[PDB]
């Protein structure tokens, strides 16, 4: 158990960037703090993810299971949850940017996010995430960033 095998392909990721299509999310997220994300391979076609966010009520965490969906190569779709995530770009030794979308009966929501190899936002990741954001005619309130405001973190093992 807990062998150093596939585990190398999984771990924890710190989301130091955020983007929301709905004003409310932007308003709420812009006022909150950086979030967490840890993913674990449930199966060959199934995957599990643990979320950690600092909520006024305390560190709010949650773990959800998704299904493999190699849309744009290592993308994931959670039909049961109505949430899709697609890794846009990621550095083996640097920052990474992943795109996410969720659709509800009659409504489509998109949420862009950026994660750092550790709980620390980098200028490079910032400029990169923004460069793409600007290419889509994004607006400041549409994006959300968290500076050296870290404190609550999610465990890995
Ligand atoms: O519409 C979406 N959320 C709702 C509904 O989802 C939820 O309320 C919870 N959520 C999941 O259970 C979830 C289970 C499985 C998958 C999830 O993503 C869940 O979040 C908790 O998330 C939160 O409280 C907040 N959330 C993050 O800060 C976030 C930060 C980093 C990473 C996150 O995922 C976050 O949600 C706000 O989220 C919401 O209001 C939604 C859309 C697009 C992309 C999303 O991520 C959404 O969740
Ligand atoms: Ga979510």
UniProtKB/Swiss-Prot annotation:
Source species: Coturnix japonica (Japanese quail)
Keyword Zinc-finger in annotation: no
GO cellular component, one term: extracellular region
Keyword entries, A-Z: Antibiotic, Antimicrobial, Disulfide bond, Immunity, Innate immunity, Iron, Secreted, Signal, Transport
Subcellular location, record wording: Secreted
Main location: secreted
Role description: Siderocalin-like lipocalin tightly binding a variety of bacterial ferric siderophores, also binds long-chain unsaturated fatty acids such as linoleic acid, oleic acid, arachidonic acid and, with a lower affinity, long chain saturated fatty acids such as steraic acid. May act as an antibacterial factor, through dual ligand specificity, both as a siderophore-sequestrating molecule and a lysophosphatidic acid (LPA) sensor.
Subunit structure: Monomer.
Keyword Transport attributed: yes
PROSITE patterns for this protein: LIPOCALIN (PS00213)
A Pfam family reported for this protein in Swiss-Prot or TrEMBL: Lipocalin
Family per record: Belongs to the calycin superfamily. Lipocalin family.
Protein name, UniProt field: Extracellular fatty acid-binding protein
């Amino acid at each position: 158990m807990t062998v150093p095998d596939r585990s190398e392909i999984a771990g924890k990721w710190y989301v130091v960037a955020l983007a929301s299509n709905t004003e409310f999310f932007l308003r709420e997220k812009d006022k909150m703090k950086m979030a967490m994300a840890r993913i674990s391979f449930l199966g060959e076609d199934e995957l599990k993810v643990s979320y950690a966010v600092p909520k006024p009520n305390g560190c709010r965490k949650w773990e959800t299971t998704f299904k493999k969906t190699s849309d744009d190569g290592e993308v994931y779709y959670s039909e049961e949850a109505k949430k899709k995530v697609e890794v846009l770009d990621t550095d083996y030794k640097s920052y990474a940017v992943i795109y996410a979308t969720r659709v509800k009966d009659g409504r489509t929501l998109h949420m862009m996010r950026l994660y750092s190899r550790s709980p620390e936002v980098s200028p490079a990741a910032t400029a990169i995430f923004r460069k793409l954001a600007g290419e889509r005619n994004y607006t400041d309130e549409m994006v959300a960033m968290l500076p050296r405001q870290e404190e609550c973190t999610v465990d890995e093992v």
